[PDB]
Structure formats: C-alpha cells, structure tokens
Amino acid sequence: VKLAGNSSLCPVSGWAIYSKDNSIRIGSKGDVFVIREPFISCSPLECRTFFLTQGALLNDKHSNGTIKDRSPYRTLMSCPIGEVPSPYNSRFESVAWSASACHDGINWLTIGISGPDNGAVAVLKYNGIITDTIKSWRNNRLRTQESECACVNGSCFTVMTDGPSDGQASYKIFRIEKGKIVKSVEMNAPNYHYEECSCYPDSSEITCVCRDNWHGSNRPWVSFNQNLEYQIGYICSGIFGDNPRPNDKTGSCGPVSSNGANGVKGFSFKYGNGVWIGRTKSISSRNGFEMIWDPNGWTGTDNDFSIKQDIVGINEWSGYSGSFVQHPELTGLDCIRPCFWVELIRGRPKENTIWTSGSSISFCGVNSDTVGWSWPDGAELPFTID
Amino acid sequence: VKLAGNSSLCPVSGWAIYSKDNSIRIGSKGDVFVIREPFISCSPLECRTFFLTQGALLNDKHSNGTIKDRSPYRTLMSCPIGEVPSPYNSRFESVAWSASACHDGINWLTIGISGPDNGAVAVLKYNGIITDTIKSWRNNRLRTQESECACVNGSCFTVMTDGPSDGQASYKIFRIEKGKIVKSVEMNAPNYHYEECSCYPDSSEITCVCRDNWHGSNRPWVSFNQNLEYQIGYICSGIFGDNPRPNDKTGSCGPVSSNGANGVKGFSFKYGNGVWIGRTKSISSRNGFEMIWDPNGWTGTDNDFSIKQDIVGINEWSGYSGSFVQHPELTGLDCIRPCFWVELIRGRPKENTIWTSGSSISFCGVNSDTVGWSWPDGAELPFTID
Amino acid sequence: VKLAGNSSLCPVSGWAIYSKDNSIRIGSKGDVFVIREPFISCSPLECRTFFLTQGALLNDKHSNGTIKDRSPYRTLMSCPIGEVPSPYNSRFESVAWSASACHDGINWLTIGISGPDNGAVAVLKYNGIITDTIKSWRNNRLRTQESECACVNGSCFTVMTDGPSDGQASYKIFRIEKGKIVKSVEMNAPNYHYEECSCYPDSSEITCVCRDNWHGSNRPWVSFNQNLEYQIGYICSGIFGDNPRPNDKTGSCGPVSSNGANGVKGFSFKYGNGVWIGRTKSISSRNGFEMIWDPNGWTGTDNDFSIKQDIVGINEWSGYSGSFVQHPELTGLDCIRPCFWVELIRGRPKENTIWTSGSSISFCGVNSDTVGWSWPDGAELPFTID
Amino acid sequence: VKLAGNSSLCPVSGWAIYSKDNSIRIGSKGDVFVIREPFISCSPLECRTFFLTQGALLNDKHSNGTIKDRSPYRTLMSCPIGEVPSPYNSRFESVAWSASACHDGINWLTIGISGPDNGAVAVLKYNGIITDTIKSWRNNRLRTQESECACVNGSCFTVMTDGPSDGQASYKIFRIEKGKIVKSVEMNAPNYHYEECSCYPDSSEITCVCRDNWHGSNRPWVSFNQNLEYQIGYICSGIFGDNPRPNDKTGSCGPVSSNGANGVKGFSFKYGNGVWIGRTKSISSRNGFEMIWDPNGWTGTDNDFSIKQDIVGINEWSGYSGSFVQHPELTGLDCIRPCFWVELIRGRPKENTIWTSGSSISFCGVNSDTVGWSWPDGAELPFTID
Ligand SMILES: *[C@@H]1O[C@H](CO)[C@@H](O[C@@H]2O[C@H](CO)[C@@H](O)[C@H](O)[C@H]2NC(C)=O)[C@H](O)[C@H]1NC(C)=O
Ligand SMILES: *[C@@H]1O[C@H](CO)[C@@H](O[C@@H]2O[C@H](CO)[C@@H](O)[C@H](O)[C@H]2NC(C)=O)[C@H](O)[C@H]1NC(C)=O
Ligand SMILES: *[C@@H]1O[C@H](CO)[C@@H](O[C@@H]2O[C@H](CO)[C@@H](O)[C@H](O)[C@H]2NC(C)=O)[C@H](O)[C@H]1NC(C)=O
Ligand SMILES: *[C@@H]1O[C@H](CO)[C@@H](O[C@@H]2O[C@H](CO)[C@@H](O)[C@H](O)[C@H]2NC(C)=O)[C@H](O)[C@H]1NC(C)=O
Ligand SMILES: *[C@@H]1O[C@H](CO)[C@@H](O[C@@H]2O[C@H](CO)[C@@H](O)[C@H](O)[C@H]2NC(C)=O)[C@H](O)[C@H]1NC(C)=O
Ligand SMILES: *[C@@H]1O[C@H](CO)[C@@H](O[C@@H]2O[C@H](CO)[C@@H](O)[C@H](O)[C@H]2NC(C)=O)[C@H](O)[C@H]1NC(C)=O
Ligand SMILES: *[C@@H]1O[C@H](CO)[C@@H](O)[C@H](O)[C@H]1NC(C)=O
Ligand SMILES: *[C@@H]1O[C@H](CO)[C@@H](O)[C@H](O)[C@H]1NC(C)=O
Ligand SMILES: *[C@@H]1O[C@H](CO)[C@@H](O)[C@H](O)[C@H]1NC(C)=O
Ligand SMILES: *[C@@H]1O[C@H](CO)[C@@H](O)[C@H](O)[C@H]1NC(C)=O
Ligand SMILES: *[C@H]1O[C@H](CO)[C@@H](O)[C@H](O)[C@H]1NC(C)=O
Ligand SMILES: *[C@H]1O[C@H](CO)[C@@H](O)[C@H](O)[C@H]1NC(C)=O
Ligand SMILES: [Ca+2]
Ligand SMILES: [Ca+2]
Ligand SMILES: [Ca+2]
Ligand SMILES: [Ca+2]
C-alpha cells in the first residue's frame, strides 16, 4: 500500500548506528565498485543503498580518476544496506551522473540524469520502466539530489538545478506520480543557491536542506506542500552546517558569505524552531562528522547548542551526507523516523592514490540511550594499484 | 497471462538511455564472461540480457580467440539488464552457438542451436524444459536471430536460415506454442538473403529486419500474420542500414549490390511509409552508432531524413545491434514500446589483443525530450593477458 | 504435490543436449570448486546439479590431490544446472564423501555419508532437516549411488553397499518416506557386485543399473516394487557398458569376468527386451562417450546394435555418468522422460597436474531430430598452480 | 506463527554432523570474510550462520590482526548454513563487536553492541528495524552471548554482562518482545561470573550455560521462567567444561578455582540430573572437541560418564562453541531438538600468521545411530599474505 506521509517527524534525542559496509577495506581484495554518493532509501519491505560508479572496481587500472564526473560510463546502482557495492549483489538502476530515488509504497522511482553538459536529460523510471523525461532548460549541467526524494500519499517530490555552481542558477521543484511529472514550479529565489538537496516528508509536507555553492557557508532550505506552494530560507543557526565554513559566530537567516564558496552535500532536520544539524568536524576540510541539536537554530542566529553527538573522529575522513526516512508503513511507529548516511571518502584529492571512493555508515534517530564515537572508513592506503 | 500483441508500436520521437553494463571495464579485474550478442528480452516482470559465451572469462588464458565461433563450448546464458555477465549472476539457458529467446507472458522460450556444421540441431525450451527440436534441412550452418523472437496471442515466432553466407540460402518462418513447433513455412525469396533477423510484434503481426550477407548493403525484411502468410522486401531508403555499405545515394527496393558483401546484425522499425533506422557511423568498419528517422524511407527511395540522434561517437567501437519491445502488459501503456540494444565490440580483429568481447547499451523509445550523445565502452586495451 | 511415478518411460530415439557448465574453463580465473560426481536431480520447479568437493577451489594450493576420497572435509552441495559450482551460487547440502539426492514432489531428500571407513553414518535430510541415520552394518566403507534416488508416490528409494570393492559385499535397498526409513531389505545376490547405482522410476517400479567392481565388465541391475520385492541380473548385451571392458563379443546374463576388475559409474535405460546403453568410447580408459540402442540388449547376448549417437569424442576426457528423470509433474508429458549427465574428468591420474576435477554435460531423451557430436571439457591444462 | 517453546528437549543419544563450511580452505583463493563467533540460529524456514567481521578478507593486507577486538569496523553478518561467509552471499545485520540473534517465529531479532569501552550501546533490530537500545550500566565493556538467544511464546531472552573479566561483574537477564525490552532483572550472583551465555528454551523456560573468566574452570548456569524468576549455579560434574581447566577430579557445585582464570565460550544441555557436556580435548589450549554424557553431572559431583563421542581430534584446532535449537515448528518433531556448533580457530596466537579466523562445523542431536570422528578445519598455513 502507498505511503500516507501525513504524520510528523519522530522526536529524537540521539542517533543509533544502523549500518557500516566497510567497502574499501573489503574492496582491497574483493570485487567492489569504485563508488560515490552512497545514499539510502527504503521500501516498505527493505532499505537499499544507491550509489554512482564509473563502472570500475578497486585495485584495478580503470579506477584511475582521469575520467570526469559527468561521463557516459556513470551508472546508478543499488545494493542491500550494509553490504558492499559489488557487481554480484547490485541491481542496475539507471545510466546517470546525477541521481535520485524513492519508493512510494508500491514501486521504486529512480531519476537518472545523463547526456552532455549543455543538454542533459533526466530519465524517470517507475518499477524499472521509463515513464518520463526532462531536458535541461538552462543548458548548464542539469543536476539533482544525490539522495532520496520524498513521497507523500502516492506523489513523490524532488528538486533539480540548472545553471552555474558559480552564481545565480535556476531551481525547480517537481511533483511525480507513478514516474510521471504531473506538476512543476520554478523557485523565485534570487541571491539563493540550491544544489544536492536532502528532502524528507513531514505532516504531508516536504522539507529540503541543500548546499549553497555560490556564497553560502550555512545551508539553504526549501519547504512545500503537495501543490508545490513553497517557502524558502537559510538555516539561521551560528552553528554553520556546510564545508568549508568559518568558525561559529552569530549566524544569519540569509546566505553567510564568509567561506561561502564551494560546499558539501548535507542535511538537517527541522523541529519547530529547532534543528538537528549534521556536519563535518573540520571547518576547511572534509574531516570528521557530528550531530548537533540547536533548540532554536532554525529561526535563531545565536551559536548556542545543548546536545552534541560524535559520529566520525576529527582526524578521520568523511564527505557527503544525506537524510533518509523510515515511514510508519515500515516501522509500525506513529511518526516518521529520521535517519542519515555519511559517505567516508578515501583517495584523491586528499591522499596519494590514483582513485577516489567512499565508504558508508548510517544512523537512525531514536528516543532512547545512544553514544558518541568514531566509526571511520578503516582502509590502509595506498593500495596495490597505486 | 498471455501477451496480447495486438496494439500498434508507440509513436517515438527520440531514444532515452535505458541501460549500460560497463562489463569490459569491470571485467578487467572482476569475473565477467567473454560474451557476444548481448540481446535483451522482457518478461511481464523483468528485462533480461541474453548472451553467448565460449565459457571463458576476461583476463584469463581461455579467452584466447583461437576457438571457432560454432564450438561445442558455446552456451546461451542470461543476466538481469545492466548487470555484468558474470558466472555468479548469470542463469544458464542452453548450449548454443546461435540462439533466440522470448517470453509469451507465461513462460520463457529459448532456442539454442548446437551440433556440427552439417547437421546442427535447434533445441527449444519452454520454462527451461526441452519441448522440441529442429534439424538442419540444408546441412549448412543452421542459424537464427541472435536477437529476441516475437510473441503474439500465446504464439511466438522466429526465422531460421540454412545455407551459405556467400549466395542463395534457405529461409524459414516458424510458429511456436508452449515451445512446440505448430507451423512452419519456407520463404520463397530468390535473390534475397536473410540472416540474424530482428523481429518485433505490431498489431497482431511480426516484422523482421535482417542482414543480407550476400549482395545487399540495405536491409531485407519479412513480415507475416499468425498463419505465417508473409510479405518480403528490402528497405528502400537511400539511408543504408548495413555495414559495410556505400555512401548515401538513391536507394533501391531490392538488394543494393555496392559493398553488399558481408554485413552486421541490425534492426529497424516500420511506421507506415516511414522507418526508424539504427546504423553504424562508419561505412567500412563497425564504428559509431546513430538513430535516423526517415518519414518515407520504408517505401521511398530518396536519402532525405528529418531526425538524427547520436548514440556512439564516430571513433568509438560499436558492433551488433537488435530490437526488443516492451508490451503494454509490462508498461501499462496503450501501445507496444520499441527499444533497442547495441553491442560494443572490443579486441580482435581491430585491436591488438588475444580476445574479443562486447559491452552493452540499451535505449527505449519515448515521445518526450531526449538527447544525442556518445555512450562508448570505455575499457583501456590491451589487458594483462595480452 | 507429490510425484505419482506411475507412468512408463518415454519412447526415445535420440538425445538432445540439455546443459554444459564449462567449470574448469571458467575456474581457471573464477572461484570454482574442485568437484567430483556432478549428478543432476529435478524438483517440480527446477533441475539442480549436486556435486562433491574437498572444500577447495581451482588454481589454489588446497586443490592438491593429497587428500583421500573419504575425508572429513568432503561436502555435498548443489547449484543450478549449467551454472558453475561456485561458493557464491551453491547451496550446502550435507557433509558427505558419498551421497544421493531426490525430490518427492514436496521436498528435497539428501543422503550424506561421512565418518570413518569402519563405522560410516549416512545422514538423511528432508527439507534441510535431519530426519534419520543409518550406520555401516559391515564396517567397510558404507557407500551409495553418487546419483539421484527414485521417488514413486511419496516414497523415495535408494541402494547402499557395505563391504569390499574386491569381492563379495553386502547390498541393501531402502524405502524412505519424508526422510525416514520405513523399510529395508538385503539383496540375496551371491557372485554379484553392486556399486554406485543409477536408479529411476518406471510404472510404479524402480530400476537400478550399477557398477560391478569385482569381476564384471558388463553392468549389474536390480529392480523392485514399492514393497522392495526385487529381481536381479546383468545386462546381457555384447555391447559391454562398463570401463575397463573387453572388445565387444557375445555377452552374458551373468558377470563378464574378462577385464571385469575396476569400473566406472554408469547407467542404462530398460525398454522391454531393449536397452539404451551409455558408455565410454575407449575400452581401457575413461575417454569418449556414446549412446547405443540395442533392441534386445537387456535379455539377449548378441553384440548387434541399430542406433548409435556420439556424445564425447574418442580423444576427449569423460568419466562418471548417471541417469536422471523429469516427471510428468515437471514436463506436462504423459510419460517419465529419461535424461543423463556425463562427468568430464580433468587432471590426475591421466594428466600432469596436482589436482582432479570434472566438468558437466547433460542430455534429455526426445522423440524428434537429434545429432551426434563431441562436447568435451575444453580446458587447457596444466594450470597456473601446477 | 509464534514459536510455542513449551515442549521438552528431545532425548539425544548421539550427534549427527549437520554442516561444515570449509571456509578457511576456500578463503585461500576465494573472497571470504575473516570471521569469529560463527553461531547458528534457525527461523521456521531456514538456518543461518551469524558471525563477526573486522570487515576484512583472507589473504588480504587488511586481515592484519593488529586491530583491537572491539573496533568500530566490527560488524555482525549472516549467511546460509554451510556456505562460506562471503561478501557476495552474506546479509548485513548490525554494527557490533558483540552480538546475539534469534527468531521468534515471525521475524529475526538481532542484538548488536558497539561504541566505546566505557559506554557501549546494544542496538536491537526486529526485522532489520531498530526497535530499542540498552546503554552500558557499569561503563565497562557491555557484552552479550556471541550465540543465539532463546524465544518462547513470542518473547525472546538474552543475558548481558557489564564489568571486568578479572573479578566480580554485573549480569542482567532480559525479556524482549518485537525487539522491545519489556522486562529486565539484575542477577544476584556474588562470587559468580557469567560471560558469553549459550541459552536455549525447554518446557517454557530458558537455560543458559556460560563462561566463568574469573575463577571458575567449570561452567556457570542460570535458568528462568518468562517473568525472569531465576535460579543460578555451576555444573557440578567432575568432567570440567571450560578451557583452560584442570584434569578431571571431584567436581564442585560452585566455581572450581584450579586453572579458573580465563576461558572459552561453551555450552551444555541439561536433562534432569544429567548433562550433555561439549568441551575441548586439551586442558591447556583450544585443541580437539568431544561430547560427553554424564547421567548425574548437572547435580552430582563425581567424574564418571556413560557416553563419549569424538568431534575434533586432540591435535586439531578448535575454539568457541555454542548451542542452538530447532523448534517443532521447523522439524515437525514432538520436542525441541538440541544442536551445537564449533568454531575452528586458525592463525594467531597459536600459528605463525598475521591473522585469525574460524571455520564452522555443526551437529544435531538424534536418537538414532551416530559415530565419533574428527572433522577439522584443514587449511594449510601459513598463507600467501603471511
Ligand atoms: C592514470 O592515467 C594517467 C593519465 O593518462 C597516466 O599517466 C601517464 O603516465 C605515463 C608514465 O609513464 C606517461 O607516459 C603518460 O604520458 C601519462 N599520461 C598523461 C596523460 O600524462 C597513468 O599512468 C595512469 N595510471 C594507471 C593506468 O595506473
Ligand atoms: C487486444 O486483445 C485484447 C485481449 O484479447 C482485447 O481485450 C479484450 O477485449 C474483449 C472485447 O470485448 C473483451 O471482451 C475482453 O474483456 C478484453 N480482455 C482483456 C484482457 O482486456 C482488446 O480489445 C484488443 N485490443 C484491440 C483489439 O485493440
Ligand atoms: C593462443 O593460442 C595460440 C594458438 O594456439 C598460441 O599461439 C602459439 O604461439 C607459439 C609461440 O609461443 C607459436 O609457435 C604459434 O603461433 C602458436 N602455437 C600453435 C600450436 O598454434 C598463443 O600462445 C595462445 N595465447 C595464449 C595461451 O595466451
Ligand atoms: C602437494 O602436496 C605434496 C605432498 O605434501 C607436496 O610435495 C612436497 O614437495 C616438496 C618439494 O620441495 C617436498 O619438500 C615435500 O617433502 C613434498 N611432500 C611430500 C609428502 O613428499 C607438494 O609440494 C604440494 N604441492 C603444492 C602445495 O602445490
Ligand atoms: C504448547 O502450546 C501450544 C500452543 O500454545 C498448545 O497448542 C494449543 O493447545 C490448546 C489447548 O487446547 C488448543 O486449544 C490449541 O488448539 C493449540 N494450538 C495449537 C497451535 O496447537 C499445546 O497444547 C502446548 N503443548 C503442551 C502444553 O505441551
Ligand atoms: C601488520 O601491522 C603491523 C603493525 O602496524 C606491521 O608491523 C610493522 O612492521 C615494521 C617493519 O616493517 C616494524 O618496524 C613494526 O613492528 C611495525 N610498524 C608499526 C608502525 O607498528 C606489519 O607490517 C603489518 N603487516 C602487514 C601490513 O602485512
Ligand atoms: C494519516 O492518513 C491516514 C490515511 O489518510 C489517516 O487514516 C490518518 O488519520 C492520518 N493521520 C493523521 C492525520 O494523524
Ligand atoms: C490522499 O490520497 C487520496 C487517494 O488518492 C487522495 O484522493 C487525497 O487527495 C490525498 N490526501 C492528501 C493528499 O492529503
Ligand atoms: C497415475 O496415478 C494417478 C494418481 O494416482 C492416476 O490418476 C493415474 O490414473 C495414473 N496413471 C496411470 C495408471 O496411467
Ligand atoms: C499412492 O498414494 C496413495 C496416497 O497415500 C497411497 O495410499 C497408495 O498406496 C499409493 N498407490 C500406489 C503406491 O500405487
Ligand atoms: C488468440 O488468443 C486465444 C488463444 O488461442 C484465442 O482464444 C483467440 O481467439 C485468439 N485471438 C486472436 C487471434 O486475436
Ligand atoms: C503466551 O502466548 C500468548 C502471547 O502472549 C498468550 O496469549 C498466551 O496466553 C501465553 N501462553 C503461555 C504463557 O504459555
Ligand atoms: Ca557553500
Ligand atoms: Ca551486406
Ligand atoms: Ca567392472
Ligand atoms: Ca574459566
């Protein structure tokens, strides 16, 4: 049966570890894909890890990072959560160098973008069958979430960006039913910048927390109903969630220009005026990870926080991170449980290898005892191929 | 339930990318079969990639291409679409050095031809159980589609050739129910030459577009009803569909003798007087691929065209290509969707290796926005074993 | 539903190739078990390949044939027919250095013998659960079929041997329901010798064709009803079915002493006074394979034959061979279809390697066009490990 | 449906071999995890082998045993019984360096403990969904069974220890329904020491046989009803069950201090005043294994016994061992069948390698004929990586 999506988020005091795949450790000898963007999404039966690959395995010559991000070889694929991304346990999903995926309760929806930078096409599959497409409307690198879309009552929702990572781009929200786009709207957001949105349902509404690559070191957000009537803003907290970023001062409800260029895929959970912020430990590099609870960090600008839980050690490698949810139809709970994944990037540019790949850890929000720690990748680099 | 097969082909203005397995890139380290003829066919539940193997893996000594094409080691096998053809994810189908496969809605039908050059036997399996055999009637390399067969109303249909690739041969159309041959007819086609037919259903009828290895650089066709009452011809378009071929001149509704010797497996879709032609970019070798819409190419002789969409770049390796359809019982559409696959041949004879294998890309016909590009194999040759 | 087993064997004029796994060819690089005794058995849903392994893979040091046949490491395992015996696609069945398996229509029965030579225990599993055991009654290498047992109307049947391979041993027939032995009888067979019986159902009765290791170069048989009331004899045909054997003279309805010592696992199909004999092409070594039809070879002693079909070339490697059937509950036929498998042994003692393993080919009996040929192993020995 | 758990243990006169995975032998070439604690547990449909991994494979550099036992990389995973623990056939369960698992009849319950030594958290999953957490209450290495938990009437039960392995610690019994902790009680057991409990159901009650790492060379026990009303004691038999241990003298119903320091995970089955003791053959190291029936060993102090059955030879490697049961809902029997597994440890500290891993053999209790033998690991050490 289709997901209702009408209950609020679960109250969450801590994050319990849910999975760890040890991809790069195992891939040293085993046949494991070189991957990026290991996002998680759940059906009413299971939870899956989606990822992007150049069609190359670790410790092989083809893992040579000479190929561009947006290449003809890049594919979206999925494996069971906690298992390694192997050609022997992965479903092929779509040919894509930018992707999104979500289950409406009946079938899997996957959004795969491929093609040239000046005319990329996003191909929509529902139950493995192509059901719709969209072409680039600004002819400048059509790109999407790199994490799960959000589904409420048989409609799934996503956000796409067309334009520069450098300045003003064009941002669109989409409403999708059974793989077919039934409504879309462009966001009136001058001076804002949206990339790689983490989106989730909450009381029949979707909230996305994204990445400003232009001039924001805090995170932009967009929230909308099913008719795509939206509000936009930035996370006001002085606890800045992007990377790179400055040290924590008083925040802003607009874009924080200080160290605002570049960014990393991220997420955050809104609870009234409060926010659960997932971010790196390092302000300048992709090192460490921590969950921080600010009871007024959504609308307030002060840099005060009450709860902080360690996820990845300051000296260890992290990277991309995204939100994912588990619905009452899967858990049997009365609310929608918030969860998150972290990509643990190893190799270039930070380390002396010829390749780059990411590990995967994930955590679920629970209202019971938890603990801070460090769950890093664990691979000993460089590898045999280097 | 049985596939009805009584609706028209879907109107198609473009081709969206459906799959890419990157199998040769992955097969550098991974345990992937050395394959040829990666044809796709679909059940009402899934789509599968069938292929032929010498029973050898990439980067192994057994992949040494000294063994003849019609060896006793050759086997037909299948794997899920977009995944690598590996011994760990492949389903064994039949012992064959020539094959065809299709799903009637209830069960899989596979046709595997093996045996000596002068007395080959086609073994027919319905649901993996041997249900019939056909013996070579002209004692000269009995051979079939290397592509999916077509099914209508609980009957599946195929074309088989017995005789030389050098001149006049014998061609038979077959009607199959539950894996049993219920009716066959020999085609009365002097001066014609049919090999490796790409066949598809359309309004309760089957259309095959084949390969003239004798004296034709345009593609021969045959079409028939359920009682096997047939018509024959060639594609009249000046846009020549075979390889090798001459440059585009005024076409012919018979065989075009210019560079008509030899060829490559191919396909085309008929829409009234018009034709969707898929072909290589080079006229001499198997390089590049493109889709061309000629509104008057089926029956008209001129070499004008409306639409052209790139698939594989001019300097990139292509090879075999074939058609497959998706029935409304799979898609929920009102028509039968045309799709196609391309084999991307790497190694001998063109490249300095000891082996030869094909990669896989597939596309499906949509009436929404698409884009031309190049989706090539991508493996760095030679390999360790070379 | 449970197999009736009450119809007669299918009339068979020829043998169509059913499978070929190319194990040793693929195992050169891939992770494939070193195997012996690749027998086939079928459930109403599928057909499976069972095999014995020392728990070692090809091209690995552990494949060193220093270990004895009846060791603690030997396990019975099964993989889908035509697929390679890999740790990634094989079900574990039982710890055994001698085995049998059959499906009664409801669940799998497996018989696994392990333990010391002077007190071996056969463990009976039904649906993976241990349901019964038998201990060695003569304390001399308790051993069984090395091929499928036979099931008629919810009772499965097998034959076990306890005693010397050198002279008179003890032979017992068993009746098994839901994995539990409900009746057994000892065979009153002085001067006879039974090892490695190939057994099949036929009109509610079981016929086994076995291997005389003592002093018979023709094959002994035993046939019985469901109450285990049995008849015994030898195949009278001058076309001798064992290996080693003499050249074809006039036969005997008793044991043929000439070249009677040693033997090979084999099979034969009784049709009234006639017999389908499967045997090697070489009289002294395990080379080649052929099917021979003698219209009076069961009860008559003359060495005349009307039909002969080549399976494996005279210069190629063969080995063990067994019978298997497909019931009307699987095929939809009115009779029980006879089929057979051949093990293609490579390595020691015949070849200069450190190991020994077998390939697998199988054939089904059909009443339509067939052909003789040679489908050999195909591996290039010696391997890297040697 | 829920497992009733209200019948008695089956009467058992011997142990028949159930499985052997030969994983270290296969892992020489194959891609097999370096594992510890290969405990077995059964659903009403299948039996599975759970295990812990550092996320490393055999013959890889990552298998370097310098990483601590309670690392962040440690994960609980499962595979079908008798198959190798491979990344290609293993199901991810939880992130854990200490674990327990059981099936209540409806769904799998897994318990995975991870986190820092001073604040470990037990994460409970029902059907793969986090349902509860328990935090370390004594802040000293919270740890559990390393063996299956026991389920009765839709409730599952486990034992957890918090405190030193050096002296007095804290021990708690837990009652779990649908993955939620409904009741727990602390054991009032001064002078006692419980670790790594092997627990099983019997007539609506649970009996655990554990490891005294403090000052006991005989095994401690605890037993309780559904309300967790418990009894405690030690196994009085002079046949000592732990390792290290002294030679068999007069026993004690309290802790036997002689060689009582340290130990190994083990199990035993209670039958009234009698006990089935599984133990190592050596008294100093982890070598050999045997089953012993002492008709008065549970409550009596003498060191006499009736039955003894060999499992692993005196000079062969053994290690951890634990109990698992098969309920009547799986077997169709009238009682609850006792079974057990043995871990076969190869490598450090005993052997000159860089790694440590365990093999797996399992046995089930039958009332029919059995035989003593030796079923050892069998791998030739050292390996290429050593
Ligand atoms: C990865 O790719 C790079 C770029 O193609 C390779 O760099 C080459 O290194 C050799 C050194 O002998 C030079 O001769 C080439 O000219 C380099 N190429 C370029 C474009 O500068 C590198 O060898 C590759 N690494 C692999 C395959 O492991
Ligand atoms: C194609 O054939 C299908 C199935 O044979 C037709 O659907 C049937 O149409 C008849 C006509 O009244 C109905 O009685 C049945 O209820 C239909 N069956 C199903 C399964 O739908 C369909 O009409 C045909 N379409 C055409 C002719 O275009
Ligand atoms: C592939 O097979 C061919 C032919 O069997 C091998 O070529 C041989 O190479 C030798 C020199 O090493 C030459 O004398 C001949 O041309 C070939 N021999 C024969 C008997 O034809 C080639 O070595 C093989 N490649 C492999 C196994 O990697
Ligand atoms: C297979 O096993 C045999 C027997 O153990 C090994 O033979 C040994 O060969 C070496 C040669 O240096 C001798 O030193 C040993 O004494 C031999 N053993 C015996 C019992 O004679 C052989 O090396 C093994 N092959 C492998 C592991 O590949
Ligand atoms: C063990 O418990 C089972 C299930 O609770 C008992 O079986 C039930 O017994 C009651 C008693 O009349 C019947 O009403 C039900 O029909 C039974 N249910 C099932 C599923 O069989 C069983 O009696 C108990 N066995 C004992 C007490 O030894
Ligand atoms: C396993 O890990 C250990 C410790 O990290 C490695 O041992 C090192 O070896 C060097 C000499 O090569 C010695 O100086 C030290 O004893 C160790 N170094 C450190 C920093 O502790 C060992 O090489 C590793 N084995 C592998 C990777 O195979
Ligand atoms: C959520 O939706 C379901 C189905 O529409 C409804 O039954 C339920 O009352 C809703 N829950 C709310 C509004 O809390
Ligand atoms: C929920 O689903 C029903 C069923 O289609 C739909 O009609 C209704 O609009 C929905 N309610 C929402 C979206 O709140
Ligand atoms: C075989 O058995 C079935 C069920 O017992 C019966 O219906 C059928 O008549 C039998 N076939 C024969 C005797 O030919
Ligand atoms: C076939 O099965 C029935 C059902 O159990 C049995 O009663 C009868 O004896 C059988 N008939 C045979 C074995 O011919
Ligand atoms: C074919 O479909 C069924 C199967 O034979 C038959 O009943 C029906 O009349 C036929 N329909 C056609 C030929 O369109
Ligand atoms: C436990 O089983 C069910 C579940 O609570 C309950 O109805 C029944 O009364 C109980 N039976 C016992 C404790 O034996
Ligand atoms: Ca930024
Ligand atoms: Ca041609
Ligand atoms: Ca003999
Ligand atoms: Ca102790």
Residue numbers in the entry:
A (entry chain A), B (entry chain B), C (entry chain A), D (entry chain B): 83 to 468
Copy the relevant paper text.
Stimulated by the first neuraminidase (NA) crystal structures, the NAIs were designed to interact with the active site of all NA types. We identified a novel isoleucine to arginine change at position 223 (I223R) in the NA of a virus isolated from an immune suppressed child on prolonged oseltamivir and zanamivir therapy. In contrast to the frequently observed H275Y change, which causes selective resistance to oseltamivir, the I223R mutation conferred a resistance phenotype against both oseltamivir and zanamivir. Our results support this suggestion by indicating that a ligand-free form of the pandemic neuraminidase adopts an open conformation. Together with this structure we present the structures of the I223R mutant neuraminidase in complex with oseltamivir and zanamivir to investigate the resistance mechanism of the I223R mutant neuraminidase.
